[PDB]
Amino acid sequence: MFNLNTIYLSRIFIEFNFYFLFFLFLISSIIFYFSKIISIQNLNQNSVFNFLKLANIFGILISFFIHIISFWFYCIYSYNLSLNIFSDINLYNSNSIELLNNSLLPNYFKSNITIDFFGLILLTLAYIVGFVSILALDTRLYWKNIKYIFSFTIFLLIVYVYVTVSNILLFFMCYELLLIPSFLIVYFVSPSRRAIQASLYFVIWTQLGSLLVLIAISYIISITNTYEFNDLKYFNFTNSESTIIIFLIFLGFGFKAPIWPFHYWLTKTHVEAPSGFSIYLSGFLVKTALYGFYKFNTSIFIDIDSSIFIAICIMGVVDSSLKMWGQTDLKKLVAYGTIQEMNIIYLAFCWGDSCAILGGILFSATHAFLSALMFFLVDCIYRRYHTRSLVEVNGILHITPNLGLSILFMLVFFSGIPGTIKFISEFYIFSGLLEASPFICFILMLVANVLGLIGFSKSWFNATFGMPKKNTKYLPMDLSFKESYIILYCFFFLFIFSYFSSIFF
Amino acid sequence: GGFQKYPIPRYLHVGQWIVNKNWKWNTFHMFFPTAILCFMVWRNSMISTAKPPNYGEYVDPQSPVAPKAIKY
Amino acid sequence: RQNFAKNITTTDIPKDSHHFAAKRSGFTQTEQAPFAYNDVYQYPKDYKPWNYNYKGNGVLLALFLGSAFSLVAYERSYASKTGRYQRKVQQNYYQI
Amino acid sequence: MQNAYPEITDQHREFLKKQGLKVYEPKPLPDQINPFSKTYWITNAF
Amino acid sequence: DAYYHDDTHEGLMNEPHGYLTMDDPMDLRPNYEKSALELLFLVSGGAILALMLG
Amino acid sequence: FNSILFLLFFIVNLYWFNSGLIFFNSVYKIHHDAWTLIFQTDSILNKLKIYFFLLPLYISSFIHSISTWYYNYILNFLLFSENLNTNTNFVDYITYNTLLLSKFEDFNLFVYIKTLLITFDIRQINLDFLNEYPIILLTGLLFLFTTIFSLICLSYLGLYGVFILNLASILLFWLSMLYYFNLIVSENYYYYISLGKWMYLSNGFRVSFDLLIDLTSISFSFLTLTIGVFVYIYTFSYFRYEPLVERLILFLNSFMISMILLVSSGNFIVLFLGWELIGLTSFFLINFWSTRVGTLKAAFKAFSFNKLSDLFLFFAILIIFSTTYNLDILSFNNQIYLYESYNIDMFYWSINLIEIISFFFISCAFIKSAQFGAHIWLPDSMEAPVPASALIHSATLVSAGIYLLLRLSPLFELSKYAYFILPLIGSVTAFYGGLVSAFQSDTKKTLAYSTISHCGFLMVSYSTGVLEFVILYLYVHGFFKAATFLCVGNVNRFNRNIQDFKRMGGFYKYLPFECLASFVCMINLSGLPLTLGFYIKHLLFIGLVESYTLYPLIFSSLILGAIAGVFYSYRLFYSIFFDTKKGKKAIYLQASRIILNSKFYSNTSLASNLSITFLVLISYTVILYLYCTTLNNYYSLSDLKSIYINNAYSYFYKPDYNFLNAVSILNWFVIILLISVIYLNWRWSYYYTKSIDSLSKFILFSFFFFIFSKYIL
Ligand SMILES: CCCCCCCCCCCCCCCCCC(=O)OC[C@H](COP(=O)([O-])OCC(O)COP(=O)([O-])OC[C@@H](COC(=O)CCCCCCCCCCCCCCCCC)OC(=O)CCCCCCCCCCCCCCCCC)OC(=O)CCCCCCCCCCCCCCCCC
Ligand SMILES: CCCCCCCCCCCCCCCCCC(=O)OC[C@H](COP(=O)([O-])OCC(O)COP(=O)([O-])OC[C@@H](COC(=O)CCCCCCCCCCCCCCCCC)OC(=O)CCCCCCCCCCCCCCCCC)OC(=O)CCCCCCCCCCCCCCCCC
Ligand SMILES: CCCCCCCCCCCCCCCCCC(=O)OC[C@H](COP(=O)([O-])OCC(O)COP(=O)([O-])OC[C@@H](COC(=O)CCCCCCCCCCCCCCCCC)OC(=O)CCCCCCCCCCCCCCCCC)OC(=O)CCCCCCCCCCCCCCCCC
Ligand SMILES: CCCCCCCCCCCCCCCCCC(=O)OC[C@H](COP(=O)([O-])OCC[N+](C)(C)C)OC(=O)CCCCCCCCCCCCCCCCC
Ligand SMILES: CCCCCCCCCCCCCCCCCC(=O)OC[C@H](COP(=O)([O-])OCC[N+](C)(C)C)OC(=O)CCCCCCCCCCCCCCCCC
Ligand SMILES: CCCCCCCCCCCCCCCCCC(=O)OC[C@H](COP(=O)([O-])OCC[N+](C)(C)C)OC(=O)CCCCCCCCCCCCCCCCC
Ligand SMILES: CCCCCCCCCCCCCCCCCC(=O)OC[C@H](COP(=O)([O-])OCC[N+](C)(C)C)OC(=O)CCCCCCCCCCCCCCCCC
Ligand SMILES: CCCCCCCCCCCCCCCC(=O)OC[C@H](COP(=O)(O)O)OC(=O)CCCCCCCCCCCCCCC
Numbered sequence A: 001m002f003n004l005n006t007i008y009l010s011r012i013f014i015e016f017n018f019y020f021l022f023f024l025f026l027i028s029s030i031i032f033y034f035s036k037i038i039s040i041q042n043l044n045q046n047s048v049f050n051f052l053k054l055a056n057i058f059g060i061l062i063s064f065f066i067h068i069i070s071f072w073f074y075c076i077y078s079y080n081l082s083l084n085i086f087s088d089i090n091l092y093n094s095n096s097i098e099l100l101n102n103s104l105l106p107n108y109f110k111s112n113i114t115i116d117f118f119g120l121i122l123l124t125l126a127y128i129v130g131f132v133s134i135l136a137l138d139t140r141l142y143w144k145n146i147k148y149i150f151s152f153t154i155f156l157l158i159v160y161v162y163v164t165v166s167n168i169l170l171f172f173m174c175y176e177l178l179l180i181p182s183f184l185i186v187y188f189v190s191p192s193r194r195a196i197q198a199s200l201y202f203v204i205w206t207q208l209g210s211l212l213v214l215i216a217i218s219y220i221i222s223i224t225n226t227y228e229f230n231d232l233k234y235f236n237f238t239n240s241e242s243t244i245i246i247f248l249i250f251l252g253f254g255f256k257a258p259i260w261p262f263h264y265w266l267t268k269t270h271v272e273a274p275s276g277f278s279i280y281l282s283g284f285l286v287k288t289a290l291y292g293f294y295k296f297n298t299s300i301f302i303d304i305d306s307s308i309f310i311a312i313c314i315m316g317v318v319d320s321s322l323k324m325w326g327q328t329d330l331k332k333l334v335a336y337g338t339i340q341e342m343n344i345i346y347l348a349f350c351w352g353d354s355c356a357i358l359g360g361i362l363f364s365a366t367h368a369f370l371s372a373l374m375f376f377l378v379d380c381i382y383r384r385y386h387t388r389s390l391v392e393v394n395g396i397l398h399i400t401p402n403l404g405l406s407i408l409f410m411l412v413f414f415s416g417i418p419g420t421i422k423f424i425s426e427f428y429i430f431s432g433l434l435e436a437s438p439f440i441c442f443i444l445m446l447v448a449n450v451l452g453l454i455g456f457s458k459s460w461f462n463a464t465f466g467m468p469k470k471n472t473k474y475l476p477m478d479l480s481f482k483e484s485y486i487i488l489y490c491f492f493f494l495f496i497f498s499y500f501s502s503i504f505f
Numbered sequence B: 001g002g003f004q005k006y007p008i009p010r011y012l013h014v015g016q017w018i019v020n021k022n023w024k025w026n027t028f029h030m031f032f033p034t035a036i037l038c039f040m041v042w043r044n045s046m047i048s049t050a051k052p053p054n055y056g057e058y059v060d061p062q063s064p065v066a067p068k069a070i071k072y
Numbered sequence C: 001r002q003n004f005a006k007n008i009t010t011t012d013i014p015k016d017s018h019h020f021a022a023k024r025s026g027f028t029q030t031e032q033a034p035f036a037y038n039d040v041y042q043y044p045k046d047y048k049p050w051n052y053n054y055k056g057n058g059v060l061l062a063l064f065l066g067s068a069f070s071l072v073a074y075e076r077s078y079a080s081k082t083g084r085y086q087r088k089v090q091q092n093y094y095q096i
Numbered sequence D: 001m002q003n004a005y006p007e008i009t010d011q012h013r014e015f016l017k018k019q020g021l022k023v024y025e026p027k028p029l030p031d032q033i034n035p036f037s038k039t040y041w042i043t044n045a046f
Numbered sequence E: 001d002a003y004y005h006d007d008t009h010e011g012l013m014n015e016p017h018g019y020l021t022m023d024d025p026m027d028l029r030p031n032y033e034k035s036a037l038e039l040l041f042l043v044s045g046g047a048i049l050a051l052m053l054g
Numbered sequence F: 001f002n003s004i005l006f007l008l009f010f011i012v013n014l015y016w017f018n019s020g021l022i023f024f025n026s027v028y029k030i031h032h033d034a035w036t037l038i039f040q041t042d043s044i045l046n047k048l049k050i051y052f053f054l055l056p057l058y059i060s061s062f063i064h065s066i067s068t069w070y071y072n073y074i075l076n077f078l079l080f081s082e083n084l085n086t087n088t089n090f091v092d093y094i095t096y097n098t099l100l101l102s103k104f105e106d107f108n109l110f111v112y113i114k115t116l117l118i119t120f121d122i123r124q125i126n127l128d129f130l131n132e133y134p135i136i137l138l139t140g141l142l143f144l145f146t147t148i149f150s151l152i153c154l155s156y157l158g159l160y161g162v163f164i165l166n167l168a169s170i171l172l173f174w175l176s177m178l179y180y181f182n183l184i185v186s187e188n189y190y191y192y193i194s195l196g197k198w199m200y201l202s203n204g205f206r207v208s209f210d211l212l213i214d215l216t217s218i219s220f221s222f223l224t225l226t227i228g229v230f231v232y233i234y235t236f237s238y239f240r241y242e243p244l245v246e247r248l249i250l251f252l253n254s255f256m257i258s259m260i261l262l263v264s265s266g267n268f269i270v271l272f273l274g275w276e277l278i279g280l281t282s283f284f285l286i287n288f289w290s291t292r293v294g295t296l297k298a299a300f301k302a303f304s305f306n307k308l309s310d311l312f313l314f315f316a317i318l319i320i321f322s323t324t325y326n327l328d329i330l331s332f333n334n335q336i337y338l339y340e341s342y343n344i345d346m347f348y349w350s351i352n353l354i355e356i357i358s359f360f361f362i363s364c365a366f367i368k369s370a371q372f373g374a375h376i377w378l379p380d381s382m383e384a385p386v387p388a389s390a391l392i393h394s395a396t397l398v399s400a401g402i403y404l405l406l407r408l409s410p411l412f413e414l415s416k417y418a419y420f421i422l423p424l425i426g427s428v429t430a431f432y433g434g435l436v437s438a439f440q441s442d443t444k445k446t447l448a449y450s451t452i453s454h455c456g457f458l459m460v461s462y463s464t465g466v467l468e469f470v471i472l473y474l475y476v477h478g479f480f481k482a483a484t485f486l487c488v489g490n491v492n493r494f495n496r497n498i499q500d501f502k503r504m505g506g507f508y509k510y511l512p513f514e515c516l517a518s519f520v521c522m523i524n525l526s527g528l529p530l531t532l533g534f535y536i537k538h539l540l541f542i543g544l545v546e547s548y549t550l551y552p553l554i555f556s557s558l559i560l561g562a563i564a565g566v567f568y569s570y571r572l573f574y575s576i577f578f579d580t581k582k583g584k585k586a587i588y589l590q591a592s593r594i595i596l597n598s599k600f601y602s603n604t605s606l607a608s609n610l611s612i613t614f615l616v617l618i619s620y621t622v623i624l625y626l627y628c629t630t631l632n633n634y635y636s637l638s639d640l641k642s643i644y645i646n647n648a649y650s651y652f653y654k655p656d657y658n659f660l661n662a663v664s665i666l667n668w669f670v671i672i673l674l675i676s677v678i679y680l681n682w683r684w685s686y687y688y689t690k691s692i693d694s695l696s697k698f699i700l701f702s703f704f705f706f707i708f709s710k711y712i713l
Helices: A002-036 A049-088 A119-138 A146-163 A166-178 A181-189 A195-223 A240-255 A263-272 A275-285 A288-299 A307-323 A330-347 A356-384 A400-412 A423-434 A437-464 A481-499 B023-048 C059-080 D010-019 D037-046 E033-052 F005-030 F035-039 F044-053 F057-081 F090-099 F109-119 F127-133 F136-152 F158-184 F215-238 F246-263 F268-286 F293-323 F331-341 F353-369 F377-383 F386-396 F402-405 F410-415 F416-439 F442-466 F467-494 F512-525 F534-543 F551-578 F584-593 F606-631 F657-679 F688-712
Strands: F191-200 F206-213 F343-345 F350-352
Touching: A002 A049, A002 A146, A049 A119, A049 A146, A119 A146, A119 A275, A119 A288, A119 A481, A119 E033, A146 A166, A146 A181, A146 A275, A146 A288, A166 A181, A166 A195, A166 B023, A166 F331, A181 A275, A181 D037, A195 A263, A195 A288, A195 F584, A240 A288, A240 A400, A263 A275, A263 A330, A263 D010, A263 F353, A275 A330, A275 A356, A288 A330, A288 A356, A288 F416, A330 A356, A356 A400, A356 A423, A356 A481, A356 F293, A356 F688, A400 A481, A400 F109, A400 F350, A423 A437, A423 F191, A437 F035, A437 F293, A437 F584, A481 C059, A481 E033, A481 F191, A481 F467, B023 E033, B023 F136, B023 F158, B023 F191, C059 E033, C059 F057, C059 F442, D037 F109, D037 F350, E033 F044, E033 F215, F005 F035, F005 F057, F005 F109, F035 F044, F044 F057, F044 F512, F057 F090, F090 F584, F136 F158, F136 F246, F158 F215, F158 F293, F158 F353, F158 F606, F206 F215, F215 F246, F215 F386, F215 F442, F215 F467, F215 F606, F246 F268, F246 F386, F246 F402, F268 F331, F293 F353, F331 F410, F343 F353, F343 F377, F350 F353, F353 F402, F353 F410, F353 F416, F353 F442, F377 F386, F377 F442, F386 F467, F402 F410, F402 F467, F442 F467, F442 F551, F467 F534, F467 F606, F512 F551, F512 F606, F534 F551, F534 F606, F534 F657, F551 F657, F657 F688
Parallel strands: none
Antiparallel strands: F191 F206, F343 F350
């Protein structure tokens, strides 16, 4: 019963959501630039900053709704396309349907849009995490950094082009574009003074991997003049070229997606970055690297043993889990948890295009939401109690019961209880790893889910429980409606996304 | 027996020695709707409930309900 | 800091002007001057700070209408999948 | 799908019936449990 | 017990009190963060009901 | 505008419409297709007569047509689908449908109203319907949602509201469980319910949320629920005048429902969910005193052990799923024998699949049952309030391993590791716990170590392999441990949170009910002759196997643990109540004031006393029912779904002289130990010589009485 109307509606929605976002950004920027001689906030109720905040927030939200609709359309379209290809067996018949482009808006960068489930999951993560982070950075943007209110819209545009393009060069350029806005945010919006050095560490560490990926892309393009991302099927790389490409790609993308030993920059940036921008960083900016690695390694044929890469990922997991215990700083502890989860996700992609990709994608989604939750809780703790250290913070529950309850339920979700996408992803990864190498699976599970879990839970329990006798005049009240609903939405997604259609998982 | 009672701040939403005057109506309006919800859940779930045969019943091997092996 | 205007025109702020009274006679040479504004916020009676105090049916109506639409849409979709203009209800339904 | 248990004879079935056994038979959902039932929808409306 | 004090006479028995959240019940700011999050929740639920359920 | 006039007109219209419906039904039955010939006759007189005499029918049909038109328009608007069957114009459609009266052919207003009224009649429900469709799920959901919503809405439900709501829910749940207990245990009734497709766990797999109410599940479920009802009733008195009573009550309810879900789990995913839930809720109960960080240390210890057990259980479930592409408990039980011959290639050793799976299961079971080595958390878990301690230590937290073994018995029957490990560890734990409890000085610690010893005995019984004996032991231990825990909780509350009986003395008069209740509960719990708790140990020793290589150590440890019960029971009872007054003067003086003398005078709660009494009575009744079901000559227990027969019942039905005299050794050991704890003097007293004289009198009188009974008659 599938008809061409659904196909064209899916394509039109995907193409036009990008232009909706672009036009909203363009209009907001034009207003901001042409309303004032100097693009800074006027400290009065009639400032354009209120309008810009409104436009950004409710452009992101409306585009997120449209993205939900377009993602559902894509799911239907892809399922029916697979059915059309598979069902017909007559030799004379073949599925050759050609679609003609619309005459209303042009194809950005003269590229035909191609959409995949992983790309749309990444885009949805971008939308949600950007919404959370923009909601967080309101107290940080003040009177000289208001120009960074459009940073998340720029991120959304970049990610949209990144995930809706079938061109290797455009893919790489979109991947590389993410550095400037993030660095500017960390440099100009971070309150702490150590953020100045944290930004430089972030830039250098990420740019080393960017250079590695650039070398890999140069190898691919120079050897194969193609750029369509699909002509690589008709060209085979020799053993030496293939091993060089895979090594460069893995190391370069692991520089971004933290892997052992390249997580010093991640720890520094998470500790010294804005509480609202750390959410976006951990949730999304480390998964574009995973998506790029998946695309490139599945496009290229590799005839090398992945034991070294698996060992690197497992070593990173073990290192982070062991170090979890010794962190009295909640933000650094959450950063180590992010390192652990990212390393597990990366390990999920070490078997080419096998079924591990499904578990990797689900774990990426659950890790995004869980890291957003944890960093938001740390942000609330730091903002209401003027410290994020365990020694200075204790007995949160008895003065802010909602915050303590959120901490406890965050710990429960992090533990990986059944009924959560976290548990589902763990089940996928461990079920595969048991047959791949059962002893390695046992070691990984033991470490991560006992030693790292205990180290993680010690600090959070000690902070939540106790008796806050110190500084009674300065104690806070409770979570606000915004924070409470953000936490509730994170929990609701983590719980209900397990009912998503199992066709794609 | 118990600890001596001490004042609790009004602004703080905590359960220390909380007693509600309208607890009777609160219980009435929290019990019955929960019972209706669980009745709905139970009647929905009974559609997928399985029971073994009764005392005087035996399962015919050739009946459709009898287990069937996969046919290649 | 906050730069919004307190004095809104959408509605008049509830207030009580009798709790605090400004002295206007019998002053001394060491007493400070009184305060010009002495109005305090007055909450509506029966307001319970510990719950949402929501008395509207909009959310319930929206959720119920959404559920009813989902039900009818599923019925139509099942009919379409079965290739019928409407569901063909069977005489007996068994557990499954 | 094919029968998994070993087969039995109709004479054996008749013998069991004479002995007094009964053949297990699934029973239809009662009006209350059946979701396509006027009783079910009356309950929903109430 | 020997000297139990009734609730009507015990001055330290608490009735339900406290503020649910940190938001001011009487706030003159046209704040919209709560409205935005409520809209997000409602639209997510509506999309699930009207596109996915069944 | 009068209500009376409106009602009269409505009644008249109803009667007229009913009469018209009956007339039309008769005329249609007579004129199946020819009724229009008379109804729509061209004659104006006939047309007017029909319209006037069927006006209620015509107006009803007009309203129905309007409603159907609007409903069809709404559906078309919402679904972008088709037309109103056809594209008929509004006027044509409405006229046609109003003129058409065949819609009333089978409709009678009185019959329809009677059907609507009887739809909700409650006389129709029958025991046959209840047996066909269990309401256990309905009542369990009632309890669960009650607990959840009470937790969320604490302000709405004060202390009394929370108590009453949860009491009603739990009472309904317990009554339903009691009704189905008789059927499940004896009538061979078990149910497999499914709520839906919970989650996707593979490329095309999706595990459903299913529950299995079988004999194995019900044995734990009914015990836990019965203990929990009375623990709940008792808690409102134990935590009397405490700042947070609702929190404790809701935590207890949460733990109860978590354990019920664990025991009545239809698949390994639900089993793991219940495992984690019981771990988390036990952590919360232990850390109830959130303000103190000392309690947090014990809570974190228990949390660490629970997480280790979760790791082992998860790894075992992963192995099972990798071997068989299925997570159903019944399917695994009925398939494991096929794969028994398989092995798993690990790092450098080819481990037997059954052995490794059973190893992980037994490790998790020992961790959660507090066996030797992994029991370190149980003594520290006593920081919880006495109701929570009783619930966790009686049948809820420390029986998870026993439940796992019973449910997955077909796996362990083919496990070499289980055969070697269960008896040795069980006996060692029994001996260790028994001796430590005997030497213990604190009431809660003594009960905890006694619980450890009974867990060891349960492990040894399972090794023996008589599931009926294991179930009987579990029931007896749970009931009487809970009762003793409640009694000692009352004692501690009277003694002002001082749990050591070195400061307890002469409490018999101040807590009369507690003294006798503790006497009965302890004589039943500690295996003593002529008590309900003697038979569990007797059956354990009957079923003990002798092919073990470490049989000497196993048997010696079992004997020592069994005898250890007497010492701890005697010490606890005597020191708490009838020993010289050792406590602070204030404890006695504050209660001995003459002003307190009244009909209402009591140091405990009337509700507490009634709850303890009812718990003891119901425990006696249920234990007797189980004994009749299993140990009677006519075996009437339901199927256990196990094909392993141990032959242990042979020595219970037709014991030989060898075993009959062998049991006498343990009987006389217990007798000598009783004589020691009774007549042995450790302090100088005015009654030393008279006590020695009484011992001599008792010895000589016993000898003469035996002589007369056996020979002289
Ligand atoms: C302060 C919060 C702090 C949070 C931050 C911290 C977070 C972490 C820590 C957490 C713990 C601390 C906080 C807890 C204490 C809070 C204290 C407090 O605020 O107290 C006051 C708070 C509010 O009370 P109130 O102020 O007196 O009254 C509020 C207004 O009067 C109410 O007005 P109304 O009566 O008009 O209600 C409006 C609307 C309420 O509006 C909403 O809540 C909007 C919801 C939008 C959708 C969002 C997704 C929801 C996902 C499902 C969960 C439902 C929400 C319930 C809460 C979560 C569950 C506990 O009500 C409904 O109609 C309810 C139906 C909702 C169902 C919507 C389904 C959407 C589709 C979902 C996916 C598909 C499902 C398929 C199912 C198939 C069939 C089985 O106390 C409560 O009443 C607590 C309610 C708890 C939930 C139970 C009641 C709802 C049950 C719904 C049905 C489900 C049950 C079984 C169904 C079986 C048949 C299907
Ligand atoms: C293990 C972790 C556990 C964590 C959880 C622990 C427990 C937590 C407990 C505490 C928190 C949750 C429970 C309490 C939440 C608060 C409930 C509440 O009542 O609060 C009051 C809260 C505050 O009240 P407020 O300050 O007065 O604000 C009011 C709202 O702004 C606005 O209200 P309004 O009165 O102005 O009404 C607005 C309503 C407006 O409603 C209406 O307009 C409905 C009535 C009109 C019907 C249409 C008629 C048209 C023709 C005209 C007819 C004549 C006029 C009729 C109308 C007359 C007026 C009544 O508009 C909407 O709702 C728009 C929604 C539209 C999209 C979705 C629905 C439609 C779907 C598709 C429909 C298709 C078919 C229909 C086609 C229609 C034709 C095109 O209000 C609400 O309830 C708002 C809803 C959202 C509240 C927050 C939801 C949070 C939920 C959290 C869930 C967490 C789940 C986690 C699960 C974890 C599992 C592991
Ligand atoms: C465009 C793409 C997207 C773009 C991005 C969009 C982003 C937007 C944001 C939102 C995210 C959207 C993502 C997409 C979502 C897709 C949804 C969708 O398609 O919907 C349709 C999806 C499938 O629909 P369908 O297949 O199309 O429908 C046709 C099928 O024929 C229907 O038939 P069916 O058979 O398939 O039915 C399915 C469902 C039908 O539903 C039912 O029948 C309702 C059953 C309700 C049962 C309630 C109680 C169960 C537990 C008690 C059990 C034992 C009781 C006592 C036993 C005593 C016996 C002795 O049945 C089940 O699944 C049964 C499962 C029952 C267990 C549920 C709870 C398990 C525990 C979970 C724990 C997780 C949180 C732990 C927290 C820990 C503390 C921090 O349906 C649903 O949405 C089902 C939702 C059901 C919700 C269940 C309520 C949860 C209760 C939680 C209780 C936990 C208590 C606390 C735990 C412990 C705390 C300490
Ligand atoms: C060649 C064509 C070029 C087209 C250029 C487009 C020009 C855009 C100019 C924007 C001016 C914004 C201020 C207008 C005056 C507001 C007055 C006011 O507050 O009164 C309340 C009145 C009415 O309020 P109300 O109380 O009636 O609320 C209902 C609101 N509506 C009518 C929208 C349903 O005006 C508004 O509420 C309008 C709000 C405008 C700001 C919206 C911000 C969200 C993001 C969109 C911004 C626009 C970008 C383009 C669209 C998105 C991308 C496709
Ligand atoms: C981890 C180090 C610290 C972090 C920084 C990362 C730097 C290193 C990044 C990875 C580089 C690739 C290493 C693996 C190469 C595997 C293939 C190989 O060489 O095997 C012999 C290969 C494979 O041989 P083969 O035997 O498999 O098959 C071909 C055999 N013949 C030719 C005989 C037919 O042989 C060759 O053809 C030689 C290729 C050598 C290439 C070495 C230089 C690479 C230069 C580009 C990358 C530079 C990145 C620098 C970044 C900045 C550093 C500060
Ligand atoms: C559709 C089907 C039904 C849908 C329902 C879904 C329900 C999902 C779960 C909801 C959990 C709600 C928790 C509310 C907690 C409120 C605060 C509280 O209790 O006090 C905190 C107490 C004290 O709170 P307080 O007194 O300071 O403050 C109370 C008032 N507030 C919070 C608003 C300020 O603090 C603590 O020490 C933390 C204790 C946390 C205990 C959590 C136990 C949960 C146990 C649940 C068991 C469920 C079993 C499920 C079995 C089946 C599984 C499939
Ligand atoms: C050698 C023959 C073969 C068998 C080998 C085993 C020999 C017997 C070993 C018995 C060990 C008993 C240890 C009990 C420890 C109790 C500790 C306690 O709670 O405190 C003391 C409690 C008293 O507690 P109390 O609170 O009243 O006061 C304590 C006072 N202080 C601290 C000063 C000690 O009970 C006793 O005092 C009784 C124990 C001591 C007497 C033991 C007599 C043993 C008789 C053995 C008879 C054997 C019959 C033959 C067959 C045997 C084999 C089948
Ligand atoms: C032996 C059990 C002892 C403990 C029982 C505790 C109570 C359990 C709950 C009652 C029984 C429910 C299952 C009924 C099964 C059934 O349909 O059984 C079938 C019968 C009808 O008979 P038939 O379907 O066989 O013809 O159902 C009815 O008669 C339905 C009438 C209502 C029954 C009670 C409903 C309870 C739910 C809440 C109602 C709230 C009303 C409004 C309040 C404001």
